[PDB]
């Protein structure tokens, strides 16, 4: 019949809940009570990146720790030099409204997207010198929210269509579509081995996917409200996501469970960005207030405060080699930390 | 080559300022409303290129979004004004229209930004109350206790029943706007049907700009 489907679904949810409860023999806070606390860490702004005409919404580091990509609502994809602050490129976006920007690991391509429902990718190594859009992807009927690069030919995009899409640059058409989410998926992160990608939506749930099988593998719904940003752990089997409820939770793919919850009574605003360190020792999260907070991944302790922004933070990034940290806010400034 | 690289940076930022200065003389606008209301009368984001009194107005109309409106609005914190369109002709969707109104009025990001109202199809409301098949406006019975205000003079040759209906809608619109937000921003209730919309929107945009400027001067 029809009610039997809902009965079986409820039985399955109860079974997975019981399995997760049984697998939760203990928590790793007790284990980490032995380890030495990381202590207070203070970082200074080693570079102030002035030049943006409007509020910054997203950013992505390159393979090297010297090239910076920043996107603002004015519609200008501008590439900066981390070491010497000089502007490298300035790509005038066709649509002013943008919300995400990704830098290819090879460095030859850059992509951006937003409310235009267009995943515009640009070639930075043109023989003509100027930056031109290689192609635009219009398969998604919802607002673009995040994009990440697998290689020079494949890009994974998350949009407001409650779906995640994997694209092929050579053909310009969708390769695989992920539709297991009920809320609009917004934040998208790849594993270091480029085998699995995890993402979150407004349904207070984070789901892990495999790019080729085109199906959901794991789901996490430990949050109590809308979640905003989510990123992969350095090793590859874990991830942590921020949320609008002023809490951060880290999950392990093998454990299929929440391990810590990063929450403080002082904090009243939600998380807007999240990124780990090179080793995963330090968990960095951008908050909706005028500052940024840094957490310890294992001990879930408060490490330091990153001030210097007169308006809400909107983006955060960490170098591949771990030498620098870039945090962008609506104040039209990119602040580089270390 | 620091000198050559610096000159390229000096070239880029000058164009950014030159192309960013022209982005300030043009004022951005946001359009929101129900599908029933004739928003287009006044792809993804639709931008209208029109200007009045030597200043360009950029009206941003959204499409494709199904129901979510609480966070895609985050991008529109900078736009100085928001246009709300209400299809007051139909009473069935009036209740859900105000639920949307209360949603964006109490947004955690739209707390210092005013809104401008455009009750489209005001004529269709007029013939509906003139004829039958219309009662209570499908509202709570509190409309009966309402009385027409004499503070504002109606447009001449008006129907006293029509004026009673529209002013009641404005009165609740004023009530819902003054319920929360305090003096941070003020809703602007205006009517529309109409070649005077371009002039009407300009004065409303001038008012908030004037009001915001005095707010920043603390006088």
């Amino acid at each position: 019949e029809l009610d039997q489907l809902r009965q079986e679904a409820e039985q399955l949810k109860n079974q997975i809940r019981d399995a997760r409860k049984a697998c939760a023999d203990a928590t790793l806070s007790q284990i980490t009570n032995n380890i030495d606390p990381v202590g207070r860490i203070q970082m200074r702004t080693r570079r102030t990146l002035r030049g943006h005409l409007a509020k910054i919404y997203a950013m992505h580091w390159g393979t090297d720790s010297r090239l910076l990509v920043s996107a603002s609502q004015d519609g200008k994809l501008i590439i900066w030099d981390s070491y010497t602050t000089n502007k490298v490129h300035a790509i005038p976006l066709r649509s002013s409204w943008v919300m995400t920007c990704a830098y290819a690991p090879s460095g030859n391509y850059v992509a951006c997207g937003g409310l235009d429902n267009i995943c515009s990718i640009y070639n930075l190594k043109t023989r003509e010198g100027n930056v031109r859009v290689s192609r635009e992807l219009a398969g998604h009927t919802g607002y673009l929210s995040c994009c990440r690069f697998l290689d020079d030919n494949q890009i994974v995009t998350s949009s407001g269509d409650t779906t995640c899409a994997l694209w092929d640059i050579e053909t310009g058409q969708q390769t695989t579509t992920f539709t297991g989410h009920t809320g609009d998926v917004m934040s998208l992160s790849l594993a270091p081995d480029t085998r699995l990608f995890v993402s979150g939506a407004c349904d207070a749930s984070a789901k892990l996917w495999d790019v080729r099988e085109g199906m959901c593998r794991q789901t996490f719904t430990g949050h109590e409200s809308d979640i905003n940003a989510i990123c992969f752990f350095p090793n590859g089997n874990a991830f942590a996501t921020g949320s609008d409820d002023a809490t951060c939770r880290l999950f392990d793919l093998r454990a299929d469970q929440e391990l810590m919850t990063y929450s403080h009574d002082n904090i009243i605003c939600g998380i807007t960005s999240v990124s780990f360190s090179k080793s995963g020792r330090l968990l960095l999260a951008g908050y909706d207030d005028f500052n940024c907070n840094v957490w310890d991944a294992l001990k879930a302790d408060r490490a330091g405060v990153l001030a210097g922004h007169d308006n809400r933070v909107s983006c955060l990034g960490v170098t591949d080699d771990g030498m620098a940290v870039a945090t962008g806010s609506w104040d039209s400034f990119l602040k580089i930390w270390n | 080559e620091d000198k050559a690289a610096a000159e390229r940076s000096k070239m880029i930022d000058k164009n950014l300022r030159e192309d960013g200065e022209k982005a300030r003389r043009t004022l951005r606008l946001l359009l929101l409303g129900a599908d029933n209301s004739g928003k287009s009368t006044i792809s993804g984001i639709f931008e209208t290129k029109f200007q009045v009194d030597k200043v360009n107005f950029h009206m941003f109309d959204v499409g494709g979004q199904r129901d979510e409106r609480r966070k895609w609005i985050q991008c529109f914190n900078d736009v100085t004004a928001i246009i709300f369109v209400v299809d007051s002709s139909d009473y069935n969707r009036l209740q859900e229209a105000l639920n949307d109104f209360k949603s964006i009025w109490n947004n955690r990001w739209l707390r210092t930004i005013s809104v401008i109202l455009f009750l489209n199809k005001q004529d269709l409301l007029a013939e509906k109350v003139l004829a039958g098949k219309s009662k209570i406006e499908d509202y709570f019975p509190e409309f009966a206790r309402y009385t027409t205000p004499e503070d504002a003079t109606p447009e001449p040759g008006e129907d006293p029943r029509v004026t009673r209906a529209k002013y009641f809608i404005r009165k609740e619109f004023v009530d819902i706007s003054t319920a929360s937000g305090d003096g941070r921003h003020i809703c602007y209730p205006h009517f529309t049907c109409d070649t005077e919309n371009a002039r009407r929107i300009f004065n409303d945009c001038k008012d908030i700009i004037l009001q915001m400027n005095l707010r920043e001067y603390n006088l």
Partner: single-chain antibody
Amino acid sequence: VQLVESGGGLVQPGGSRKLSCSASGFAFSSFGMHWVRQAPEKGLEWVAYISSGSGTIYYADTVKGRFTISRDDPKNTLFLQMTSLRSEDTAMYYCVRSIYYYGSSPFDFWGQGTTLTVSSADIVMTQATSSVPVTPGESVSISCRSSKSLLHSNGNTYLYWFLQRPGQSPQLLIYRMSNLASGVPDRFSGSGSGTAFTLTISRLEAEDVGVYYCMQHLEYPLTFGAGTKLEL
């Protein structure tokens, strides 16, 4: 991307003439332009340089304050005013196009050129050898010596390599250490220890024959080393 230079020929010494180069296939306003001279059967030599927007204009120390180079982006043409002409000014003038940023490829495209015939305390680039016959299929390596170390404190050197096949303009081969240029095979490799800079070729092919040129970019005078020719 194509550069065509018009003007020149036989000129009375001491006269004046205008040299114009036409650029196409790229945004002229965003590129820096260089002029290099090649006197008949001699080595390369820098002449003048103009940047994007003509913010800074530089000239060779030998002809400083003598020539005049101008550009016009709307008309997409580059100009070089020949104020005076001597026996030293007869050369194979090439027009070079480049940008300067992180990961850029300076001196990557060179124009065909136009022929003009007349009727201290700076870094000098020298090569140990001047010519060597190399049979096809083997590996050929050359070395260069610089007056001063090119290892800038930023973290990279500024040694450029070029191949001037007989009958066409030189083309860029290597612009930095541990990386390769565009449109060139991977057999070319280069390295430097700060004093002696060397270029190695994995396997020389028929089209690889020609004369190799080297130019440093630390210090704008931009001296060109003596050409090393290969024979098969």
